[PDB]
């Protein structure tokens, strides 16, 4: 169950890496293309604080999910008898995944 849940975490780490890359390199195509244009540098702070924003944003759902999956496996690892779920949403997705 470790091996199976690291493999996933490493897929899903994976694909995150995939679309960072692709969009940090549209981000530094378009400034590299208005470097070229010699424009009066507002452009390229728009274009790199709005790319920033994007890559934050992608970043704060990866670890949205990385907390997810690292709360399931905590909660799998020390389930006992007894134990409450306070959120139905929670308990859902515990047994769906176990």
Excluded: C, H
């Excluded at 960072?20 to 728009?46: F, H, I, P, S």
């Excluded at 670890?63 to 709360?71: A, I, N, T, V």
């Amino acid at each position: 169950l470790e091996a199976e849940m690291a493999v996933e975490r490493k897929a899903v780490e994976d694909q995150r890496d995939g679309e960072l890359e692709a969009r940090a390199q549209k981000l530094e195509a378009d400034l590299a293309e208005l470097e070229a244009e010699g424009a009066k540098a507002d452009a390229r702070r728009k274009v790199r604080d709005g790319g920033e924003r994007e890559m934050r944003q992608i970043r704060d759902r990866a670890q949205r999910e990385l907390d997810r999956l690292e709360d399931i496996w905590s909660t799998f690892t020390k389930l006992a008898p007894k134990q409450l779920i306070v959120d139905e949403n929670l308990y859902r997705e515990l047994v769906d995944r176990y």
